[PDB]
């Protein structure tokens, strides 16, 4: 039993590709074995997708897993819809209801409004970053209307690099005119910590500034170096080191060579590798259930050109759409959960918070619960009163 | 996309139609690629994409010369994701500057087949500040509405 | 003693520390330099 899929992998993404690799082998079963075919390109440009699409099409898969960035997230979504070809990605969650795309990665929208009301801010600076899309800024720019907040949305992507510096002292500066303390950051772990060094430099680092890291890898970043400045930081992890399941994938992991599987020596694990992960188990527990379900989805290659007019979609992708969308096991990203669009749910994210020893989770927050915190109150606070 | 290679095989000279904000990377790409020349009346591209001519200039220059006129600090931006949020951010990174109180609303998300709960509740939230300034970032349809 | 300034965050504006030796470029300044604590310091050999 082989089953040919595709992998899209953009140039760079190593971890990424080490835990796929990884989770070939500790997914790989006697009743089929999956045969990757791997396709480095630039994820951006929509053109080379596009080829990299046909051209795993051509060589007839089941299945595509790979990634999109804001350009080429349209052109995944429609080609996938078209030709009924399911397509796994960890990058961030579509605007909307894309039939036959599975997505890794939860929505966070939601996680950030909750810690918002929590902190209970109402004047904060918001600095996104356009790569994964404008649809947490319209969040919280749609829910400052109705909960009355006056957010400072500040566009931190289109700064060059070569000479980003003079565009960081005049961006705290316009921080200044109303005293911004309270800062969300919702950019990449790279965009993150370019910030966080500049704000060490200028010293809005110490007590009296707020940040709040807007992804789902707070401790991916480097924190010890706004550890003890002073300010509060919090964010978000989806990967809770603290399961037996996780701890268990550390073991091995922070052992492999990193020679052959580069960057997989640490003992932690970027959310976008851990979602990859993730990804190959879903993949294999849905071939899994097509199989005890005996029914026939097997083909070849000669599924002909992409752009065959009319296009004609093969009526064993239907088949193999309920079967992702029906899988259901426990991941590294907790409990894993479809919905018949291809969204998560039924998850899980940990609120964390930076003290002076360290993160330490105050929290989560279910789809359902909203935010709830659990036990590590530093009770009391000298409440020994007098009598 | 097969409508621009079926042409491509016809084997035209130039390109002329339109893009949504969804399609337009498709386009920018594949003209960029094959060096082909497409024209187009819809909404600017952002950015410096060759092997396009757009015949629509961008707007986002007058509108925030216009704010500034009529001397606004405050005022609310009904905004539709149709044409790109280019002109939004516009407005945003401009509300730093200028120091500007933006109430920015995506009025574009809004379900055409029960849409009336949607706008007493938008309206409800743009009296809260008491909102009596606004400015519709809309298509020629969605501004009627 | 300047890194650890710097981490403990003693570098902003209200401090002020003075390098007793004649070679105050010798040194890195650029990180104390947009702190905000005024760096005092003597230079043997005038550059200009
Ligand atoms: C009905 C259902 O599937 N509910 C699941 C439950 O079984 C699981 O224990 C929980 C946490 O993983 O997530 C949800």
């Known amino acids: 039993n082989s089953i040919q899929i595709g992998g899209l992998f953009p140039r760079g993404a190593d971890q990424e590709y080490s835990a796929f690799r990884v989770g070939m082998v500790q997914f790989s079963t006697s009743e089929f074995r999956l045969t990757p075919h791997i396709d480095n390109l630039e994820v951006a440009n929509s053109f080379a997708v596009t080829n990299a699409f046909c051209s795993q099409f051509s060589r007839g898969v089941y299945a595509i897993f790979g990634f999109y960035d804001k350009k080429s997230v349209n052109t995944i979504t429609s080609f996938c819809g078209t030709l009924h070809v399911s397509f796994i990605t960890p990058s961030f969650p579509t605007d909307g209801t894309h039939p036959f795309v599975i997505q890794m990665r939860p929505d966070l929208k939601g996680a950030l409004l909750s810690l918002i009301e929590y902190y209970q801010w109402d004047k904060f600076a918001y600095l996104y970053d356009s790569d994964r899309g404008l649809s947490t800024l319209q969040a919280v720019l749609d829910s400052a209307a109705e909960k009355k907040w006056q957010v400072t949305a500040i566009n931190v992507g289109n700064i060059n690099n070569d000479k980003k510096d003079e565009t960081y002292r005049s961006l705290f500066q316009d921080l200044e005119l109303k005293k911004e303390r309270r800062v969300i950051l919702d950019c990449e772990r790279d965009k993150v ?183 590590d109150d530093t009770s009391g606070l000298e409440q020994k009163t007098v009598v």
């Open 193 to 375: 910590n370019d910030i966080v060094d500049q704000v060490i430099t200028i010293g809005k680092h110490v007590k009296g500034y707020h940040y709040i890291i807007a992804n789902l890898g707070f401790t991916d970043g480097d924190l010890l170096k706004i550890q003890f400045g002073g300010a509060e930081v919090s964010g978000f992890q989806i990967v809770d080191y603290d399961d037996s399941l996780v701890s268990k994938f550390i073991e091995r992991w922070s052992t492999l060579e990193e020679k052959e599987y580069p960057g997989a020596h640490t003992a932690t694990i970027k959310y976008t590798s851990a979602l990859t992960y993730d990804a190959v188990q879903v993949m294999t527990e849905a071939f899994r259930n097509l199989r005890k379900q005996r029914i026939e989805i097997s083909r070849r290659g000669n599924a002909g050109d992409c752009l065959a007019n009319p296009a004609v979609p093969w009526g064993q992708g239907v088949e193999i759409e309920r079967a992702l969308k029906q899988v259901q096991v426990e991941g590294l990203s907790g409990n894993i959960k479809f919905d018949q669009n291809g969204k998560r749910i039924n998850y899980t994210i940990n609120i964390m918070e930076l003290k002076t020893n360290g993160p330490r989770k105050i929290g989560y927050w279910s789809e359902v619960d909203k935010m709830v915190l659990t036990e």
